[PDB]
């Protein structure tokens, strides 16, 4: 238990339960993790946020201890549009129809898709260390193909990645965690947190969900994004983009997708809330207050 | 493992970079045949007998592949770059007394072949490249559609030991799925099962898999840089050239090779990627006519 003073809830939805740690009081704030992690990646910043907010730390649909909806040929329940609908249902179970939202990695993709589809749900939005899925794929030249190979590899038709990942999943997940930190090793993480990530990744069913998520990320999610950029749609919700310091700035890019956005680099690799918990917490608290 | 070249001799040829295994048959003008990934010299077994009626045919395992030695690699993947492989095979051919010869390559072996022609054109009378575009052209094309369709160029090029460790759990599944994936029908039916077993046994050796990853790492880095120098100088291969590709293989490929070669002809064949196994009579005929 990495969340002192937080409850544990499975929240019912039409697509399956969402697991969350729930703590604090005040305005509601939902925190969404990404790959290859779970809700526990927020354990270092959740307490400072809970000083001021009611904090709901949720496992994404099919991740962690959340239920795994059956997928289909277009990967629908693991599209960011579907994940956002499911988390909107979960927040309604708690009586939250207007809330603050911060996401990281895949959870940040859920979050900006939520803001594009249903802006009235959000008071404020923070996205951590991402650009829109459309922008990634538009940037996908030799240098990007090499640097972020896993967007194409994990999106290969089943069972190719599932088969490869089964041989030594501990090694793959630990290498991903290490490779995207400033330090290049696991020293930025709490070993208890790494064990949560390892345990989740050890399950073949959980890994299949992850591949479905990246398949959606290459196909429907991209198409959904393309419709908005073609329509000139921008997020109206007050928005914060944080990114790890370790091409146009991320702020230059999000200003093209959002009409009220501020942003800043954090001295950190990808995993801002774990590598740079103090700076990340401070920036979020200032933003959401 | 089957002998798929009835009556061909066998040689290990010493070079400064390690031994090259070859099957050798026929008589006449010398013709070197180079395989690619994830195969070995035996992929030429359905066309080599026909070629051997007209040529002295040398069917070699690439450096580090099949039964050729595996040089230790380095931080720039040097021995598995196509420039280094071409230098090594030039040495091997010199050991046989061939300093000017005909060359046909497929897949990685075709990349060795056009690099050989760019670096050392005087070594070649004529050259054929099967189902490839230049490495520079593949990476230039890179966008979302190609990243998704041809993922393995970026996957196998990731820093060791990532692809090595992913390939280790079930290597048979991966090599068979690749072989099947690039044929016209998408299954293994085009291959002789005895040839598949050669490919499988090679891929079952972690040292051989590491070489393959080093080949793709070179393919992403030094090989691409070597190509980039030539295209930005407008260097074109002067050696008479044939480009043969499968209609369900690459991707107009002739238009691409006309930018890289000043005397090139080409044709498609109805086939997936593996032209000499999927379309042996047509491939043999095209080669015999071109080299004759
Ligand atoms: Cl992401
Ligand atoms: Cl190739
Ligand atoms: Cl190609």
Swiss-Prot record, chain A:
Annotated site location: Important for enzyme activity: 129
Stretches assigned to the AB hydrolase-1 domain: 27-260
Keywords: Hydrolase
Outcome (variant: residue 105 to N): Loss of enzyme activity
Example of a GO MF term: haloacetate dehalogenase activity
Binding positions for fluoroacetate per the UniProt entry: 106, 109, 150-151, 214
Record keyword Lyase present: no
List of catalytic residues: 105, 270
Reported effect, residue 270 to N: Abolishes hydrolysis of covalent reaction intermediate
SUPFAM superfamilies with a match to the protein in the record: alpha/beta-Hydrolases
Result, substituting residue 214 to F: Reduced catalytic rate. Minor effect on substrate affinity
Pfam families: Abhydrolase_1 (PF00561)
Function summary: Catalyzes the hydrolytic defluorination of fluoroacetate to produce glycolate. Has lower activity towards chloroacetate and bromoacetate.
Family: Belongs to the AB hydrolase superfamily. Epoxide hydrolase family.
Protein name (Swiss-Prot/TrEMBL): Fluoroacetate dehalogenase
Curated annotation (Swiss-Prot), chain B:
PANTHER family: EPOXIDE HYDROLASE
Assembly with partners or alone: Homodimer.
GO MF, one annotated term: haloacetate dehalogenase activity
Effect of residue 216 to F: Reduced catalytic rate. Minor effect on substrate affinity
Keywords tagged on the record: Hydrolase
Effect recorded for residue 273 to N: Abolishes hydrolysis of covalent reaction intermediate
E.C. no: 3.8.1.3
Record bears the keyword Chaperone: no
Pfam families: Abhydrolase_1
InterPro entries found in the cross-reference section: AB_hydrolase_1, AB_hydrolase_fold, Epox_hydrolase-like
Spans through the membrane: none
Top-level taxon: Bacteria
Reaction(s) catalysed by this chain's protein: a haloacetate + H2O = a halide anion + glycolate + H(+); fluoroacetate + H2O = fluoride + glycolate + H(+); chloroacetate + H2O = glycolate + chloride + H(+)
Name this protein carries in UniProt: Fluoroacetate dehalogenase
Residue numbers annotated as active site: 107 (nucleophile), 273 (proton acceptor)
Site residues, Important for enzyme activity: 131
Outcome following mutation: residue 152 to N: Reduced catalytic rate with fluoroacetate, but increased catalytic rate with chloroacetate. Minor effect on substrate affinity
Residues given in the record as fluoroacetate binding sites: 108, 111, 152-153, 216
Residue span, AB hydrolase-1 domain: 29-263
Function comment: Catalyzes the hydrolytic defluorination of fluoroacetate to produce glycolate. Has lower activity towards chloroacetate and bromoacetate.
Family: Belongs to the AB hydrolase superfamily. Epoxide hydrolase family.
Gene3D superfamilies listed in its UniProt record: alpha/beta hydrolase
EC top class named in words: hydrolase
UniProt entry tagged with the keyword Hydrolase: yes
